Every structure is written in C-alpha cells, then in structure tokens.
Amino acid sequence: ALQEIEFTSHNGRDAIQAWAYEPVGTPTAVVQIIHGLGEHSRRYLHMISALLDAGFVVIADDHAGHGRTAMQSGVWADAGDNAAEVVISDELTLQQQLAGQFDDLPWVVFGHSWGSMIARAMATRPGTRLDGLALCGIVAQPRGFETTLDHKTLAKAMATAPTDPAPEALVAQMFDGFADRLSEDDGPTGWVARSKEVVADHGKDKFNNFGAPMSTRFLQGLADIYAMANGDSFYATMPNIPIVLFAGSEDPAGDFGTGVKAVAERLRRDGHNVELHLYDGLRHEVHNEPESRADVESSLVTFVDRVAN
C-alpha cells in the first residue's frame, strides 16, 4: 500500500513531498528514513523494500531544498530562514501524518549524514515519537565543523546577504577533512563511497541535483544542527532507548571512525546501550556500498525487531 503525503513546510514556502509505504499483512513497526544533504528519500528504494519484506511501515520525505520538494518548488539547497528549526519541525510534522493509523507500533528513526544530525536534534525535543534510534554516516568531530569553520565570518555573511550563495571559503571550511584520504583517481566526491559506481550514480541522479549551491542561511543551518546534534544537551537528554550506529572507517563525516567512536563512548559513559557497526575500508554511504549494504539492512531489521518498545 502506498500513500502520498504533502504538507506545507514550517518555512511556509515548500510543499514537502512525502510517502508512506505499508507492507502486506499486519506491520509490527514504523521506520522513518531521514535523508542527508544533496540526496532524496526515493534513493532508499533497496532499503525501503527490505524494511517492507520485514513487515515495517516506512515513512520518508524529501527535505526543504531537496529531491522532489526542490523539483516542485524550484528552490534547491535552501530551506528558508532558521533552516535547522524548519527541517526538525518538518520531520515531526511527517510523524503526525500517520496519527491514528499506527499509534500502537514502535517508531524507529533512521537518519543519514544531515539526516543523522536532524535525528539527533529530534531525539532531544519533547513529543518526538522515538522508541529506537539508527544513525548512518554520523557527523561527529570532522576538522571542518570542529575547528576550520570560521563562525565570525559566517555570522557577518548572515548579517549582509543571508539569501545569497554561501561564500566559497565557508563551504570549503565546513567540509574541511572530507578529501583527506582521497587520491586524484577518487574525484572531489570520492568520500561518498569506495564504489565508483555509487559515486557516478550519486552525480547523475537528477533528484540529487549535485553541484547545487547552498545559501548562507542554509550553511548556518548546517552549523546550528551540527551544534545541536553534538552538544551537551544531546548527550544529557538522549532518552534511554536502543541506539544503533552505522559508519565506514574511511568516512570523513565521523572523522574516519574516531568521531563516531567518541559519540558511542560518550553515550555509553552516560548509561546508554549503543550498537556500533564500523565497516573497515568503506566510506560515507555504507547503506549503498555493495560489500556493506546487506549487513546494514539486515542489522537495521534485527535492531527494529528488538527496538520494538
């Protein structure tokens, strides 16, 4: 069974394109997929199918500035003012689109990259429906977000021209670390996957619209959600629910396994149960890399079957 859900974004501009996929038979759980930067929810076709085969409802949308939402509105790589609050609020609104249909079922959030930061940010808001947390391509302690990004220069650019293309220097500062283990044969987006096939497909997918320039205010939104996701309030208010992490050891987003380990570690220090899957020699999109995809999907299915409150 398929449902199309549209709603007005918290930004008042975008018609957020959303889908709910229901399996045949009586479902046991709801899985909300939150996609990352420069991609869309319908890229998760293999994983959506696998979660339906396992008897889960799947709900996902294309965020403000992305995929079919961008393709209908005409605005890529901008989510309007307060970018961070908009995509958080939008992911909460998506949950309420199933109110009364599945209130008895456990609800697992799966976030990738930017989706991981949104998920972590949602986990700390009262009234977020969340019985289990699954993060993929965790953004934790890469040099760019930690150190290189000059927040004064971003603040000044946010005061002069918040709707303009983000200055090139702030983009390159933000993603500093992402080319550290790539040769020239890899390319500028080689950190996306060891697999050149997945990287080329990432580039061609018209619903990724790769290259599309972020707005200043969008970049401030990346900095804001990065700070919410990795701040003391996250660690201290993360509810005691099952947590699973999926990362590639070569993924720069989690500082090549080190940043991901520190997330797990701090969560464990504060009494949380964290299941860490680290795929040795794989890059960012371990859910799409052909040597890891099956393990990410089979681990997430086992996770959901137990993380069923």
Residues that bind ligand CCCCCCCC(O)O (CB under 6 A): 36-38, 113-114, 210, 253
- Contact of residue 289 among ligand CCCCCCCC(O)O, ligand CCCCCCC(O)O, a copy of itself, none (CB under 5-8 Å per partner type): none
What is the secondary structure of 196-249 as a DSSP string? Answer: HHHHHHHHH-TTT-TTPPPBHHHHHHHHHHHHHHHSHHHHHH--SS-EEEEEET
In terms of DSSP H, where are the helices of the chain? Answer: 45-53, 67-73, 83-96, 114-123, 143, 151-160, 168-174, 196-204, 216-230, 232-237, 258-269, 293-306
- The phi, psi pair for 66, rounded to 5°, reads -135, 155
210 binds, among ligand CCCCCCC(O)O, a copy of itself, ligand CCCCCCCC(O)O, none (CB under 5 to 8 A by kind): ligand CCCCCCCC(O)O
Check residue 288 and give left, alpha or beta (phi > 0: left; psi -120 to 50: alpha): alpha
Nearer to ligand CCCCCCC(O)O, 114 or 279 (CB): 114
Nearest Cα neighbor of 286 from 135, 77, 174 is 135
Q: How many CA atoms lie within 13 A of 216 on its CB side?
A: 17
* Piece of the chain touching ligand CCCCCCC(O)O by CB under 6 A; list 33-41, 59-67, 99-107, 301-309: 33-41
Provide, rounded to whole angstroms, the least separation between the CB of residue 293 and ligand CCCCCCC(O)O. Answer: 18
Task: Specify the residue, 239 or 290, whose C-beta has the smaller distance to a copy of itself.
Answer: 290
| Of 74-82, 132-140, 145-153, 191-199: span binding a copy of itself (CB under 8 A) | 191-199
Under the binding rule (CB under 6 A), the answer on residue 37 touching ligand CCCCCCC(O)O is yes
Phi, psi of 58 (to 5 degrees): -120, 130
- Residue with smaller CB distance to ligand CCCCCCC(O)O, 101 or 209: 209
Strand-pairing partners, residue 136, are 112, 246
Q: Does residue 158 sit in helix, strand or coil?
A: helix
**40 interacts with a copy of itself by CB under 8 A:** yes
Identity of the residue, 243 or 253, whose beta carbon is nearer to ligand CCCCCCCC(O)O in the bound complex: 253
On whether the CB atoms of residues 68 and 39 are closer than 8 A, the answer is no
Is residue 269 near a copy of itself by the rule CB under 8 A?
no
Q: Which of residues 66-85 bind a copy of itself (CB under 8 A)?
A: 68, 71
- Count of residues binding a copy of itself (CB under 8 A)? 31
CA dist., res. 103 & res. 30, Å (int)? 10
220 binds, among ligand CCCCCCC(O)O, ligand CCCCCCCC(O)O, a copy of itself, none (CB under 5 to 8 A by kind): none
- Which residues are CB-neighbours of 12 under 8 A, at least 6 positions away? 80
> Does 49 engage in binding with a copy of itself (CB under 8 A)?
yes
Please count the CA atoms within 13 angstroms of the CA of 14 that sit on its side-chain side: 29
Q: What are phi and psi of 145, to 5 degrees?
A: -70, -35
Q: Which does 217 bind (CB under 5 to 8 A by kind): ligand CCCCCCCC(O)O, ligand CCCCCCC(O)O, a copy of itself, none?
A: none
- Token pair 């590639």 is found at 248
Which member of 22, 34, 36, 60 binds ligand CCCCCCC(O)O (CB under 6 A)?
A: 36
Residues that bind a copy of itself (CB under 8 A): 1-4, 21-25, 40, 42-43, 45-46, 48-49, 52-53, 68, 71, 195, 197-198, 200-201, 204-207, 288, 290
